[PDB]
Amino acid sequence: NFPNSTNLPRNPSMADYEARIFTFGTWIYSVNKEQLARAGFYALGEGDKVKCFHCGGGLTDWKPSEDPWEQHAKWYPGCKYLLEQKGQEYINNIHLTHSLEECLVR
Ligand SMILES: O=C(CN1CC[NH2+]CC1)N1CCCCC1
Ligand SMILES: [Zn+2]
Known part of the structure; x- marks a missing residue:
């Protein structure tokens, strides 16, 4: 499914930071979940x-x-x-x- 480039969000139920932060739960993974939520990410x-x-x-x-x-x-x-x-x-x-990271090797 293609990425959304309109100014309107694809999942408006996750538009609030607090909504997103609830999706993670106990988060054992390597990237901090508050940081993931601030960048607009919710957990699947x-x-x-x-x-x-x-x-x-x-x-x-x-x-x-x-x-x-x-x-x-x-x-x-x-x-x-x-x-x-x-x-x-x-x-x-x-x-x-x-x-530039890509080119300093390939
Ligand atoms: O997982 C990724 C890319 N990175 C891998 C390393 N960790 C951060 C994400 N994707 C999946 C969806 C299609 C593009 C590539
Ligand atoms: Zn995005």
Whole structure:
């Protein structure tokens, strides 16, 4: 299913931070859940799979080193929530970084 790039969220029931934070429960995984919720992610109950309330973007198999906002921007750069909370400059920083990380090896 394609990512949502409209200014309207795909899952408006998860639009409030408090709604999202309730989805995790006891969270054993490597990335802090409050951080995941602030980046707009709620939990699916399927290991450490999160989905963005706005773009619907899904992310799984999180490493301890990884940042929710960075991961959000890498995989779901079209997201209007991300663009609202972080601004296009941040997004360009993140993408230049990830594209330069890729090239410093491949
Ligand atoms: O899991 C990912 C990408 N990363 C893997 C490492 N941990 C953070 C997310 N996705 C799944 C959905 C399609 C794009 C790739
Ligand atoms: Zn999003």
